[PDB]
Amino acid sequence: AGPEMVRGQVFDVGPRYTNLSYIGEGAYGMVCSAYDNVNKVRVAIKKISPFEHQTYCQRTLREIKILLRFRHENIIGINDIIRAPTIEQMKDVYIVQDLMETDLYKLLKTQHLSNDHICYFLYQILRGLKYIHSANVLHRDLKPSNLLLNTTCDLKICDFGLARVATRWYRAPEIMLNTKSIDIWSVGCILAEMLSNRPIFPGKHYLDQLNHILGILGSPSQEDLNCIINLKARNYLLSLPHKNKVPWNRLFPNADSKALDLLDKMLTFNPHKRIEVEQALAHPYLEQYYDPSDEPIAEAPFKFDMELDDLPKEKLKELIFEETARFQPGY
Ligand SMILES: O=c1cc(N2CCc3n[nH]c(-c4ccncc4)c3C2)cc[nH]1
């Protein structure tokens, strides 16, 4: 027979994983679902080809190391990793993970959410984020397609390729004008998107991203623009005419007033004044779900043993080969 082929990509994951079906592709690689003949369930398999680029090698190693350390209901795990028997033959890495039903991006394209479901999904996002932040880790790329959902509305955060120890539509202003507050801004954008089924700040480019933000928040104050900022971005913001602030209730007239109060606190221009994860979980909007006795935190802060940014890609490939050795049948 041979290895299965999907949308031009070889998925060399047999004999254990068969009956492959395409899910999607993006900067993370290509994801298929497959039948696991050992556990007798369908799983997700992500194929990555990172070895030609130092940056892609860093991302692959960071994701593996973080996801194999983390253990939380609202965070995707890694169940298995497939790669070649020798480092010379290793060109691709297959990360096997729990298969979910859909992601929030696809769900929001076809479904109107009830207030109770928006509240429940926001709670799960924040519960997972509380764990990530408690480990001194930033996700850095929270968006609807990175939030996975199963048939019983369990939510898991995935894609830790850009995660670090503490689409541009979900990027915080401080990222564009230059911490944990960058993830809170992304969560605020996702909340706004759940309230209206449309992105709140759909910029076509960086200047347009700034214009969409100021279009709702209004012109930034002197305090908002006093810190370290890119000179070009500061000059651009100063060259703009005054913009009025749009009240949240005008943008989301049918939303729960408590949801808009929390939205206001997450979508704060100044990161020093933006609400933190624990305070967001304790907000009255989340009162029905908030359960501090059932919101685990990391046992210790996450730490990489080596300076990964400094390592040549050949060294990173050896570390990836070493990290994945434990999954080799038979180790
Ligand atoms: O890193 C990553 C990992 C990703 N996935 C692999 C894990 C997973 N389980 N279920 C799904 C799924 C996604 C969409 N519709 C149905 C199921 C995925 C998607 C995606 C982006 N980035």
Side-chain angles (χ1 to χ4, degrees), residues 9 36 38 59 74 85 126 138 150 154 157 164 173 183 210 212 248 315:
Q9 286 248 66
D36 175 350
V38 172
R59 293 179 192 169
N74 302 118
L126 292 173
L138 325 165
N150 73 6
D154 294 324
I157 303 166
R164 280 194 173 264
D183 287 338
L210 293 175
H212 272 87
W248 297 108
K315 176 66 179 182

Short mmCIF file of all heavy atoms in Angstrom, two decimals, residues 9 36 38 59 74 85 126 138 150 154 157 164 173 183 210 212 248 315:
data_model
loop_
_atom_site.label_atom_id
_atom_site.label_comp_id
_atom_site.label_asym_id
_atom_site.label_seq_id
_atom_site.Cartn_x
_atom_site.Cartn_y
_atom_site.Cartn_z
N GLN A 9 0.27 16.59 0.35
CA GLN A 9 1.23 16.31 1.42
C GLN A 9 1.25 14.83 1.80
O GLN A 9 0.19 14.24 2.04
CB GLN A 9 0.93 17.17 2.66
CG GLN A 9 1.32 18.63 2.51
CD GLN A 9 2.48 18.99 3.39
OE1 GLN A 9 3.59 18.50 3.22
NE2 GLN A 9 2.23 19.87 4.36
N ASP A 36 -6.70 5.95 15.08
CA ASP A 36 -5.64 5.36 15.92
C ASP A 36 -6.11 3.92 16.21
O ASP A 36 -7.08 3.71 16.94
CB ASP A 36 -5.51 6.16 17.25
CG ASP A 36 -4.52 5.60 18.28
OD1 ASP A 36 -4.05 4.45 18.10
OD2 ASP A 36 -4.18 6.32 19.24
N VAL A 38 -4.72 1.66 18.00
CA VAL A 38 -4.35 1.22 19.35
C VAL A 38 -5.44 1.65 20.35
O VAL A 38 -5.98 0.80 21.05
CB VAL A 38 -2.93 1.69 19.76
CG1 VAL A 38 -2.65 1.39 21.23
CG2 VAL A 38 -1.87 1.04 18.86
N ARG A 59 10.24 27.39 17.28
CA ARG A 59 8.79 27.28 17.50
C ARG A 59 8.38 25.83 17.77
O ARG A 59 7.62 25.57 18.71
CB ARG A 59 8.01 27.85 16.30
CG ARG A 59 8.20 29.37 16.18
CD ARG A 59 7.47 29.99 15.00
NE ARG A 59 7.94 31.37 14.79
CZ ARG A 59 7.65 32.11 13.72
NH1 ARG A 59 6.89 31.63 12.75
NH2 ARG A 59 8.12 33.35 13.62
N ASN A 74 -8.14 22.70 29.82
CA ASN A 74 -8.39 23.70 28.78
C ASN A 74 -7.18 23.96 27.90
O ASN A 74 -7.14 24.97 27.21
CB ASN A 74 -8.94 24.99 29.40
CG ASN A 74 -10.22 24.75 30.18
OD1 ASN A 74 -10.29 24.98 31.38
ND2 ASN A 74 -11.23 24.21 29.54
N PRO A 85 13.55 7.47 11.89
CA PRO A 85 14.42 6.80 12.85
C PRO A 85 15.79 7.44 13.01
O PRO A 85 16.41 7.22 14.04
CB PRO A 85 14.59 5.39 12.25
CG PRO A 85 13.48 5.23 11.29
CD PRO A 85 13.26 6.59 10.74
N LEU A 126 -10.28 31.83 29.77
CA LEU A 126 -9.61 32.46 30.92
C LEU A 126 -9.05 31.42 31.94
O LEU A 126 -7.94 31.62 32.45
CB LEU A 126 -10.56 33.48 31.59
CG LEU A 126 -10.88 34.76 30.73
CD1 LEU A 126 -11.91 35.60 31.39
CD2 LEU A 126 -9.63 35.62 30.51
N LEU A 138 3.49 33.30 28.06
CA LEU A 138 2.56 34.10 27.24
C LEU A 138 2.23 33.23 26.05
O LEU A 138 3.15 32.64 25.48
CB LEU A 138 3.26 35.37 26.69
CG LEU A 138 4.29 36.04 27.56
CD1 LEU A 138 5.11 37.00 26.77
CD2 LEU A 138 3.60 36.79 28.67
N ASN A 150 -15.23 20.64 21.45
CA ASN A 150 -15.75 19.27 21.22
C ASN A 150 -17.29 19.33 21.22
O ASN A 150 -17.85 20.41 21.43
CB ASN A 150 -15.17 18.26 22.21
CG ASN A 150 -15.68 18.34 23.63
OD1 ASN A 150 -16.59 19.10 23.97
ND2 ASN A 150 -15.09 17.54 24.50
N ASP A 154 -16.63 21.58 25.58
CA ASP A 154 -15.35 21.65 26.28
C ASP A 154 -14.44 22.42 25.34
O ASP A 154 -14.47 22.18 24.13
CB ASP A 154 -14.76 20.25 26.53
CG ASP A 154 -15.58 19.41 27.49
OD1 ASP A 154 -16.13 19.99 28.46
OD2 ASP A 154 -15.64 18.17 27.29
N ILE A 157 -7.29 25.38 24.33
CA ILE A 157 -6.41 26.32 23.65
C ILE A 157 -5.31 25.48 23.00
O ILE A 157 -4.70 24.66 23.67
CB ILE A 157 -5.78 27.31 24.67
CG1 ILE A 157 -6.89 28.10 25.45
CG2 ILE A 157 -4.81 28.29 23.96
CD1 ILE A 157 -6.38 28.84 26.68
N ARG A 164 6.11 32.04 24.81
CA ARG A 164 7.39 32.42 25.41
C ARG A 164 7.26 32.63 26.90
O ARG A 164 6.17 32.89 27.40
CB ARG A 164 7.89 33.72 24.77
CG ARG A 164 8.56 33.52 23.42
CD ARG A 164 9.33 34.73 22.98
NE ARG A 164 10.09 34.45 21.77
CZ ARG A 164 11.37 34.10 21.75
NH1 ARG A 164 12.06 34.01 22.88
NH2 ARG A 164 11.98 33.84 20.60
N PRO A 173 -2.20 46.66 20.95
CA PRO A 173 -1.55 47.88 20.45
C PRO A 173 -0.07 47.96 20.83
O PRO A 173 0.71 48.34 19.97
CB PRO A 173 -2.36 49.02 21.08
CG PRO A 173 -3.65 48.41 21.52
CD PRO A 173 -3.33 46.98 21.86
N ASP A 183 -2.06 38.84 25.85
CA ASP A 183 -3.04 37.74 25.75
C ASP A 183 -4.43 38.22 26.16
O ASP A 183 -5.41 37.78 25.58
CB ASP A 183 -2.60 36.55 26.62
CG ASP A 183 -1.43 35.74 26.07
OD1 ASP A 183 -1.18 35.80 24.82
OD2 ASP A 183 -0.81 34.99 26.86
N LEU A 210 -4.35 50.01 13.41
CA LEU A 210 -4.34 51.13 14.36
C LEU A 210 -5.60 51.98 14.20
O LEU A 210 -6.25 52.31 15.20
CB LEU A 210 -3.07 52.01 14.19
CG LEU A 210 -1.71 51.37 14.56
CD1 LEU A 210 -0.55 52.32 14.22
CD2 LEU A 210 -1.64 50.99 16.07
N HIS A 212 -8.56 51.10 13.01
CA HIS A 212 -9.74 50.39 13.50
C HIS A 212 -9.81 50.49 15.03
O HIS A 212 -10.87 50.77 15.59
CB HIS A 212 -9.71 48.91 13.07
CG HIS A 212 -10.33 48.70 11.73
ND1 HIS A 212 -9.59 48.83 10.57
CD2 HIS A 212 -11.60 48.41 11.41
CE1 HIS A 212 -10.44 48.59 9.58
NE2 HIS A 212 -11.66 48.34 10.04
N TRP A 248 -19.31 51.04 24.15
CA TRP A 248 -19.50 49.62 23.86
C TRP A 248 -20.95 49.24 23.54
O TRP A 248 -21.19 48.46 22.61
CB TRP A 248 -18.95 48.76 25.00
CG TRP A 248 -17.47 48.95 25.19
CD1 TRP A 248 -16.86 49.59 26.22
CD2 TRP A 248 -16.45 48.60 24.25
NE1 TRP A 248 -15.49 49.62 26.01
CE2 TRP A 248 -15.21 48.99 24.83
CE3 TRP A 248 -16.44 47.93 23.02
CZ2 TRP A 248 -13.99 48.77 24.18
CZ3 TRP A 248 -15.23 47.71 22.38
CH2 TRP A 248 -14.02 48.12 22.97
N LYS A 315 21.67 22.47 15.66
CA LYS A 315 21.62 22.16 17.09
C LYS A 315 20.16 21.97 17.53
O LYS A 315 19.84 21.01 18.23
CB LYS A 315 22.30 23.26 17.94
CG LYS A 315 22.19 23.05 19.47
CD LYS A 315 22.95 21.81 19.97
CE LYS A 315 22.83 21.63 21.46
NZ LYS A 315 23.61 20.46 21.94
#
